[PDB]
Amino acid sequence: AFLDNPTIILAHIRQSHVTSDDTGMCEMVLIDHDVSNTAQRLERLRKERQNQIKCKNI
Amino acid sequence: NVPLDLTREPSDNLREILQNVARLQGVSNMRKLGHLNNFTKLLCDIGHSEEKLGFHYEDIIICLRLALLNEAKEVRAAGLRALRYLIQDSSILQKVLKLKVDYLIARCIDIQQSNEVERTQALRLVRKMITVNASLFPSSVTNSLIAVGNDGLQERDRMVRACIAIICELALQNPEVVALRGGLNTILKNVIDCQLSRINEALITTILHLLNHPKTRQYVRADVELERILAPYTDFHYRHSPDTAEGQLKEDREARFLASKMGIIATFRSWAGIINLCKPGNSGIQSLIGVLCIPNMEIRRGLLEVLYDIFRLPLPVVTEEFIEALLSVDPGRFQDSWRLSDGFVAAEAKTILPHRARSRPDLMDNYLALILSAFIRNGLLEGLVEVITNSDDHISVRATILLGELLHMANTILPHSHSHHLHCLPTLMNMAASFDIPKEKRLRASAALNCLKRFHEMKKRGPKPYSLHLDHIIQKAIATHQKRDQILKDTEEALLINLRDSQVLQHKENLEWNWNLIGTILKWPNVNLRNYKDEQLHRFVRRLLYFYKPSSKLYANLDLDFAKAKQLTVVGCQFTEFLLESEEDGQGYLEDLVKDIVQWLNASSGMKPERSLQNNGLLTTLSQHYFLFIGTLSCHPHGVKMLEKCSVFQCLLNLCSLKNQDHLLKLTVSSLDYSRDGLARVILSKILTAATDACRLYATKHLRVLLRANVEFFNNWGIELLVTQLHDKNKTISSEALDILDEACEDKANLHALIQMKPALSHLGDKGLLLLLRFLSIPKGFSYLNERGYVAKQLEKWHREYNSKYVDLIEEQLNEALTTYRKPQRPHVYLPIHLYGQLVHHKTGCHLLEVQNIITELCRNVRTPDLDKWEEIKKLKASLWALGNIGSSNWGLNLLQEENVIPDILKLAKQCEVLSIRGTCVYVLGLIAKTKQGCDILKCHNWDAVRHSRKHLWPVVPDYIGLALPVDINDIFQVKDIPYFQTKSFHLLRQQMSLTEIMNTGLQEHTDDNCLYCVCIEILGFQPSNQLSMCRILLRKEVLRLVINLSSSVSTKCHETGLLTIKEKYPQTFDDICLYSEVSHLLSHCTFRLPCRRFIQELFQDVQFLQMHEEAEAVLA
Amino acid sequence: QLPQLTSLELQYVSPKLLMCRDLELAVPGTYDPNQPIIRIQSIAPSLQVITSKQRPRKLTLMGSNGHEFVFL
């Protein structure tokens, strides 16, 4: 086969990604016009730390 | 919100960006996004220019980059969208990159904070950035995209493919920034977990494109990057992902096998992959053959599927006996397309009957011969023999069939020197003849040889007509060809004995008769009811007649797929022909039978008011074979007279008009005989001119069945029918007729018949012009087109425009053939018609071509190639194809050897840097070898060619098919090596000193440039940074060393907990933007995993950055 | 992929050990100057790896006198 020039390669990439992507995104992203877990961890550590420090270690 | 669109643009946009900056107080997000939409509309309707806008670009950028820090996803998406509409030149992008806004975009990409609309605008913006200027792409967004595509499948991210597509689009215009941050590795490791064929091939094509040109070939390692795709096969215990679910371990293995197969059979379709996998060193093709010779019944059974679909061969069924898998690869096996509803006879004739072209190049054969030679050079036959002997039966049968197919392909597409010592099979014959080895190996080798001979017999048998209409068609054609150019008596005794043992007269119970004896009593030479006047014979005939009549409802009711259904139809055909054999005594029966058939046909067609719909019985019972009886009755001259005595032809003429039943037209168009002129051609012409569009299409497609079957006098009426079909209102019918004409024009007797009736082939597409160009190939027609000023009008047209469009045409054909591109089993890639090839044929247009001085410029272009841009490579390809079409005959080698250009092409086919033209040169050198003088010229330069044509299957070793191959296939696989482009204090104090005890600037790589805020102080007159509340210089370098240690991914939990405790204890250390700038510059230059990167970016989320917003609002007004 | 290693083929791991078929070396560990030496004739083409922390292979040669010498 002859897929060597960047134009045919670009067209192939765009069409193959657009048509054969089950999930929505590809057609939305490849429009040809232009051609929290840390908060949960912080909450857990905050609540734990208040209970945690109640004693003195020598 | 509140748009006016009628005011001073400066004051309006100033109010807009002031409300945008919002001073971080008293402004809601909804009104801010409304103002952002207003600014987008203002930028749309009013052109962007620093004069008509009233403000410089820097102010717009500094007021727009603050919407990316907004907490609302809608405002962030609106800011990204409004920033995309601003980037329209290289200067705007350069200024957007001077301020470190790429940090904010890379941040907006990798949050996955329940926002699949805000992350789409970011990718659209980076695509616009790549489009505007790809030589300035920042490394931050590059690293972000690489991290998303590298570890996005495990985190269930839904933007994986959308990021890999952008990475591949970026690697075409800026490969250094993608190879530096390790993007090519992401691409290559993303093809082994991609089951989708089109995406897998679009991913492998960019890697195979970087290896094509040298300037990009410097960005790929030697034997470790491309050869990764065949690691699942070469590595018996292959682990792709380091951390995967232990529940799925076999499904993962099958997915890896499927993806690796789809990538391996996709690198062998490109020249940059063929050359790079078959290099003369320790290549990746020898590692694929070597692991085939290891008794591992899991890898060995999976490599055979790749070998089968590499050579485009059909797979046999999974069995243990050779005689059952040999039957499944029969070229004539039934297919679903051959059913009456789908493709009744026209699709069946295409498969079994051969093409009319016996000298066309058929580039597919060239490609397959090159691949087969490259595989034989590295020892594939020895590996196949070792698989045949020392393996299981399930794999032995499949390897024996593959070896048989390869051995048959060898003596068909390979030059004699390449295939005159392959049929010896020394390693198998020495094993089958050695009585020292164990007897099991000897016996299985002998069995393999026997199976190979059986396969060869099957191959030299040929495909046979599966159906009963095509069988009669071919038999009638053969009989006509035989009779155009030039047994026992059984008087009274044996006849009566055979009539007695048949059991027809003993009892009238059907399905219990001896049908073999009936067939032989009907087919015996001199038994014709005209010389043997016996009452028992008349009883026999009357009983068979009453059985075969449809009104009796005896034969017309048996369903298809019956135990003995073909035999009953054959016996009926020879019976209605035996009745015709008695022209004076067989009227009372034949007339009755045909009249009953006409009654049934008029009742089932809809010529009655009872039901007018009987398709439920014709389609599922043997009553549809009553068209075969009329078919075998219309061949004989005395048959058509009897057929016209009854209203048969009028019945078909009336049936041609209806619109509800399309199967009846298929049945009547594939049953009648059109050998002689009469009422049989009128029905065909009526169906071809005035009928249903689908029926008309099938009728015009049923002309290959009359062409490939070599029906006599086809050039008289078939050519005229195709010419009148070219004027059809429907477009698909016209294109099909054009294709049939292009195939029929391969015979000179047919091209002379087409020229004698000058058609109008100019008002059609490119196919019509390519068909009309064939007229020049012969003087009678070339001299005709030359008078009306058509050759000189086409010469300059092909010189300026269509020489570079022919290469696009042939590349499109090759791609549609074997790359699964589909521009908006093995096919036949026949070479398109080239004007230069037609002008050289008759020595009169040859001089007309030589006086134009066209060979000199083409020779000069081939001798002085640019090989730097992609337009000059296109021009070199066009020149090579033109020179190869010129040297397709003996009058072209004369004016082609005066310049001595063939050595230049032969040297370009083995020393060029670009590999696509190195394959184009192979195709052109093959095309050169269509004549004896061409092969003689090529032999002096050590290039063999096939000296036989496509006329005979087994030609005796002493116009041709164009195929040329080097004597040593490793000559064109030499690539010049290009070196890789890479070869061209507190951290120790923290080890022994803790944090609480040390409590009783810190930015290493921080300058005025590369800081989000500090860049503005000189350009936009920002007020200098305030002094923070040595108590804070320590925590700064502490969080810096923590985020540095978080990069090794060795112990991420400890550093994450440390960062969390630092955020909990001092929530103000994550407020200085001069630290966020540093950590973002660190993210833009290191390899962080996706979860760690998301955590780091989320640490700085609930921050205010009040001073920058205040200074932006101050410098604004 | 270390727990999956439970057998080794000589065609895959070391293609030079299974193509000896004769040697002048004596079988390791068995040589005394007062006895006829036993030469290494062949090597079995398959090794079994013992599932442990160090994974010791189970080599088995074939001496010139027709007796199998199993090693570790």
Ligand SMILES: Nc1ncnc2c1ncn2[C@@H]1O[C@H](COP(=O)(O)OP(=O)(O)OP(O)(O)=S)[C@@H](O)[C@H]1O
């Ligand atoms: N299934 C059948 N197949 C052939 N004939 C049948 C069948 N069923 C009934 N028949 C009758 O058999 C007739 C043909 O027999 P003839 O040629 O007249 O020989 P035949 O022996 O004189 O018949 P008959 O009944 O003795 S007068 C048919 O036309 C029907 O009358």
Ligand SMILES: [Zn+2]
């Ligand atoms: Zn700074």
